[PDB]
Write a protein that holds these residues in place. Structure first.
Motif, PDB file in Angstrom:
ATOM      1  N   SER A 102       0.825  -1.204   0.000  1.00  0.00           N
ATOM      2  CA  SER A 102       0.000   0.000   0.000  1.00  0.00           C
ATOM      3  C   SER A 102       0.861   1.256   0.000  1.00  0.00           C
ATOM      4  O   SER A 102       0.567   2.219  -0.718  1.00  0.00           O
ATOM      5  CB  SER A 102      -0.938  -0.004   1.207  1.00  0.00           C
ATOM      6  OG  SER A 102      -1.766  -1.152   1.208  1.00  0.00           O
ATOM      7  N   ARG A 103       1.934   1.261   0.795  1.00  0.00           N
ATOM      8  CA  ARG A 103       2.794   2.438   0.867  1.00  0.00           C
ATOM      9  C   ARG A 103       3.511   2.683  -0.454  1.00  0.00           C
ATOM     10  O   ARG A 103       3.571   3.822  -0.930  1.00  0.00           O
ATOM     11  CB  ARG A 103       3.799   2.280   2.008  1.00  0.00           C
ATOM     12  CG  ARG A 103       3.152   2.202   3.379  1.00  0.00           C
ATOM     13  CD  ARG A 103       4.182   2.032   4.482  1.00  0.00           C
ATOM     14  NE  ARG A 103       3.576   2.180   5.799  1.00  0.00           N
ATOM     15  CZ  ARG A 103       4.233   2.067   6.946  1.00  0.00           C
ATOM     16  NH1 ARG A 103       5.525   1.788   6.978  1.00  0.00           N
ATOM     17  NH2 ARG A 103       3.574   2.239   8.089  1.00  0.00           N
ATOM     18  N   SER A 104       4.055   1.628  -1.064  1.00  0.00           N
ATOM     19  CA  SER A 104       4.755   1.792  -2.334  1.00  0.00           C
ATOM     20  C   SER A 104       3.811   2.234  -3.446  1.00  0.00           C
ATOM     21  O   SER A 104       4.224   2.965  -4.353  1.00  0.00           O
ATOM     22  CB  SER A 104       5.458   0.489  -2.717  1.00  0.00           C
ATOM     23  OG  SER A 104       6.260   0.660  -3.872  1.00  0.00           O
TER      24      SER A 104
ATOM     25  N   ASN B  15       8.002  11.080   7.276  1.00  0.00           N
ATOM     26  CA  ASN B  15       9.010  10.941   8.321  1.00  0.00           C
ATOM     27  C   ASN B  15       8.812   9.650   9.105  1.00  0.00           C
ATOM     28  O   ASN B  15       9.786   8.982   9.470  1.00  0.00           O
ATOM     29  CB  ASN B  15       8.968  12.148   9.257  1.00  0.00           C
ATOM     30  CG  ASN B  15       9.946  12.026  10.408  1.00  0.00           C
ATOM     31  OD1 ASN B  15       9.599  11.536  11.482  1.00  0.00           O
ATOM     32  ND2 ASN B  15      11.177  12.472  10.189  1.00  0.00           N
ATOM     33  N   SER B  16       7.555   9.283   9.370  1.00  0.00           N
ATOM     34  CA  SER B  16       7.280   8.035  10.074  1.00  0.00           C
ATOM     35  C   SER B  16       7.633   6.828   9.215  1.00  0.00           C
ATOM     36  O   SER B  16       8.176   5.838   9.719  1.00  0.00           O
ATOM     37  CB  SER B  16       5.813   7.983  10.499  1.00  0.00           C
ATOM     38  OG  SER B  16       5.526   6.782  11.194  1.00  0.00           O
ATOM     39  N   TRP B  17       7.330   6.888   7.915  1.00  0.00           N
ATOM     40  CA  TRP B  17       7.713   5.801   7.019  1.00  0.00           C
ATOM     41  C   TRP B  17       9.225   5.737   6.848  1.00  0.00           C
ATOM     42  O   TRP B  17       9.801   4.645   6.773  1.00  0.00           O
ATOM     43  CB  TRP B  17       7.033   5.966   5.661  1.00  0.00           C
ATOM     44  CG  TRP B  17       5.542   5.814   5.688  1.00  0.00           C
ATOM     45  CD1 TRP B  17       4.754   5.605   6.783  1.00  0.00           C
ATOM     46  CD2 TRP B  17       4.660   5.856   4.561  1.00  0.00           C
ATOM     47  NE1 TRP B  17       3.435   5.517   6.407  1.00  0.00           N
ATOM     48  CE2 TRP B  17       3.351   5.667   5.047  1.00  0.00           C
ATOM     49  CE3 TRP B  17       4.850   6.035   3.187  1.00  0.00           C
ATOM     50  CZ2 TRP B  17       2.238   5.654   4.209  1.00  0.00           C
ATOM     51  CZ3 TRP B  17       3.744   6.021   2.356  1.00  0.00           C
ATOM     52  CH2 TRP B  17       2.455   5.832   2.870  1.00  0.00           C
TER      53      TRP B  17
ATOM     54  N   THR C 176      11.444   6.642   9.093  1.00  0.00           N
ATOM     55  CA  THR C 176      11.995   6.100  10.331  1.00  0.00           C
ATOM     56  C   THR C 176      11.842   4.585  10.387  1.00  0.00           C
ATOM     57  O   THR C 176      12.783   3.872  10.755  1.00  0.00           O
ATOM     58  CB  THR C 176      11.315   6.753  11.534  1.00  0.00           C
ATOM     59  OG1 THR C 176      11.542   8.168  11.503  1.00  0.00           O
ATOM     60  CG2 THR C 176      11.865   6.185  12.832  1.00  0.00           C
ATOM     61  N   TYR C 177      10.665   4.074  10.019  1.00  0.00           N
ATOM     62  CA  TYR C 177      10.442   2.632  10.058  1.00  0.00           C
ATOM     63  C   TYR C 177      11.291   1.911   9.018  1.00  0.00           C
ATOM     64  O   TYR C 177      11.830   0.832   9.290  1.00  0.00           O
ATOM     65  CB  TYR C 177       8.959   2.325   9.850  1.00  0.00           C
ATOM     66  CG  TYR C 177       8.656   0.849   9.724  1.00  0.00           C
ATOM     67  CD1 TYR C 177       8.636   0.027  10.844  1.00  0.00           C
ATOM     68  CD2 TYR C 177       8.388   0.278   8.487  1.00  0.00           C
ATOM     69  CE1 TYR C 177       8.361  -1.324  10.733  1.00  0.00           C
ATOM     70  CE2 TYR C 177       8.111  -1.070   8.367  1.00  0.00           C
ATOM     71  CZ  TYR C 177       8.099  -1.866   9.492  1.00  0.00           C
ATOM     72  OH  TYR C 177       7.824  -3.209   9.375  1.00  0.00           O
ATOM     73  N   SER C 178      11.422   2.490   7.823  1.00  0.00           N
ATOM     74  CA  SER C 178      12.220   1.852   6.781  1.00  0.00           C
ATOM     75  C   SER C 178      13.704   1.865   7.124  1.00  0.00           C
ATOM     76  O   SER C 178      14.439   0.955   6.723  1.00  0.00           O
ATOM     77  CB  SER C 178      11.975   2.541   5.439  1.00  0.00           C
ATOM     78  OG  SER C 178      10.604   2.488   5.086  1.00  0.00           O
TER      79      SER C 178
HETATM   80 CL    CL Z   1       5.242   2.645  10.904  1.00  0.00          CL
END
Ligand code: CL
Ligand code: CL
Ligand code: CL
Ligand code: CL
Ligand code: NA
Ligand code: ZN
Ligand code: ZN
Lengths: 53, 146
Positions: free
Chosen positions: B45-47, B75-77, B79-81
């Motif tokens: 979904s994110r990609s 920024n949250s994505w 950080t998680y990546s």
């Molecule tokens: Cl996340």
């Protein structure tokens, strides 16, 4: 499915990851498959050589 | 017990908000897309949503994505990546940041510029390090413009 990576052209078995549901073999195949689907979706909304698929 | 994300059905559900080339049409559409992106946790979904942002070229639409909270979401994505060492998504996220018309006030909101600067120095991926280096030099020119 769960027998092979859902990306077209990849026959690798899927791996377990909290980022998908046991249908991709790697992070690269996620990005490449989403790009393949996006391009085909754009092609389906543009001019075609046939009326019906 | 699960349901694999269908990227074709995700784009189909956004048929009325996108052009034939996948660009967000209006500022009202980018608000509904951001609401879906904020709840998107799976990588597919994110990609897919990142491709929609990358294809959108209207500056007034891209600025609206930043204003509604899209810069905080990336920024949250990011950080998680970075924690999970997701190089392909890190690459696509930085390409989105370079695509967005970020101002100096935007860069001061969070630590995204700091994380990108660290990637330009210590990332072991050649393409990610090079993309981060070009991204930092572009942001250095934006600060130098005032
Ligand atoms: Cl996340
Ligand atoms: Cl990978
Ligand atoms: Cl299933
Ligand atoms: Cl999701
Ligand atoms: Na923020
Ligand atoms: Zn694969
Ligand atoms: Zn299943």
């Amino acid at each position: 499915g769960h027998m092979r990576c859902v990306r077209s052209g990849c026959e690798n078995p899927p791996i377990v990851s909290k980022d998908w549901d046991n249908e991709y073999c790697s992070n690269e195949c996620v990005v490449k498959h989403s790009r393949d689907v996006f391009l085909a979706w754009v092609a389906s909304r543009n001019s075609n050589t046939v009326v019906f698929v | 017990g699960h349901m694999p994300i269908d990227p074709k059905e995700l784009l189909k559900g956004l048929d009325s908000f996108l052009t034939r080339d996948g660009e967000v049409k209006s500022v009202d559409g980018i608000a509904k897309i951001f609401s879906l992106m904020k709840e998107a946790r799976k990588m597919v979904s994110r990609s897919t949503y990142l491709n929609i942002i990358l294809q959108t070229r209207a500056p007034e639409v891209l600025v609206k994505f930043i204003d509604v909270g899209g810069y905080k979401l990336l920024n949250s994505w990011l950080t998680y990546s970075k924690t999970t060492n997701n190089i392909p998504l890190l690459q696509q996220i930085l390409l989105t940041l370079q695509h967005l018309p970020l101002t100096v006030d935007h860069l001061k909101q969070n630590n995204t510029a700091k994380l990108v600067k660290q990637l330009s120095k210590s990332s072991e991926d050649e393409e990610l390090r090079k993309l981060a280096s070009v991204l930092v030099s572009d942001w250095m020119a934006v600060i130098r413009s005032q």
